[PDB]
Design an enzyme around this catalytic site. Structure first.
Site, PDB file in Angstrom:
ATOM      1  N   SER A  74       0.845  -1.179   0.000  1.00  0.00           N
ATOM      2  CA  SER A  74       0.000   0.000   0.000  1.00  0.00           C
ATOM      3  C   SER A  74       0.877   1.223   0.000  1.00  0.00           C
ATOM      4  O   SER A  74       0.540   2.220  -0.615  1.00  0.00           O
ATOM      5  CB  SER A  74      -0.911   0.014   1.227  1.00  0.00           C
ATOM      6  OG  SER A  74      -1.932  -0.942   1.048  1.00  0.00           O
ATOM      7  N   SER A  75       1.991   1.141   0.716  1.00  0.00           N
ATOM      8  CA  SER A  75       3.039   2.152   0.615  1.00  0.00           C
ATOM      9  C   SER A  75       4.396   1.578   1.054  1.00  0.00           C
ATOM     10  O   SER A  75       4.460   0.581   1.800  1.00  0.00           O
ATOM     11  CB  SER A  75       2.658   3.383   1.433  1.00  0.00           C
ATOM     12  OG  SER A  75       2.794   3.110   2.805  1.00  0.00           O
TER      13      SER A  75
END
Lengths: 139, 140
Positions: free
Chosen positions: A10-11
């Site tokens: 997601s990051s």
């Protein structure tokens, strides 16, 4: 009959590189590595869309992934029906997700914002509760 | 290649589904089959939806007509469109915007909230209590 590794974070809180390393360590013979930085809810992921289109075009024998939720947050069953129909196998290396807390909260928050929009249009008693819920999840 | 109407309600709360079918039929006069389901767009075990998905994947389907996108699914409409594109199938929605009943959205959110709280509890996250509290507020 391509063998593909799919990796997603997601990051980068490096996490993506490390996920790839793990996949390649586990699956030594592979043809292609597709990665995305973004949510499993995100239907515009270029890596994911490339991979889906390749499965549907019968290029793929196997997709290997670290955890159940690397491909999608919802709709795993649909991708399973798709793969089976195109002689593609989905292999998830570990049985339980090891989802970071911030990813789950992030995803929930995205969903709640989405629902508040759907509820707001109609002016449901419920708009404010859902709006408050999203806010509380950011605290 | 088949032209198929797909209709769905989360519950009959009697003539709700029948009226959706009738609406579909007035818009599409020529159709081969009508497939219906009673259950949530989140429910991946719907018999009708699964029959439909397998038919598309087996190249049996030219066109699927539905009232709006969330009739088919709550999430992944875009995956379905990719599937249809590869299988010479077009999904037609009579309206671009969903006209979901309030009860249906609240019910779907409650299902989603229960799913997340289960996962948060599993990882002992302090967000569990907020998520439970939200599900409770929505049940009120």
């Amino acid at each position: 009959a391509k063998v593909i590794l799919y990796a997603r974070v997601s990051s980068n809180t490096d996490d993506l590189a490390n996920q790839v390393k793990y996949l390649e360590e586990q699956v030594k013979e592979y043809d292609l590595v597709i990665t995305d930085i973004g949510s499993g809810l995100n239907m515009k992921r270029k890596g994911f869309l490339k991979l889906l289109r390749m499965i549907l075009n019968n290029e793929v024998s196997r997709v290997i992934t670290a955890y159940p939720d690397r491909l999608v947050r919802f709709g795993f069953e649909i991708l399973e029906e798709v793969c089976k129909a195109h002689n593609c196998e989905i292999v998830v290396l570990n049985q339980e997700d090891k989802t970071p807390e911030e990813e789950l909260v992030e995803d929930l928050a995205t969903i709640l914002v989405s629902f508040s929009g759907k509820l707001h249009g109609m002016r449901s008693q419920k708009y404010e509760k859902v709006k408050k819920c999203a806010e509380e999840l950011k605290n």
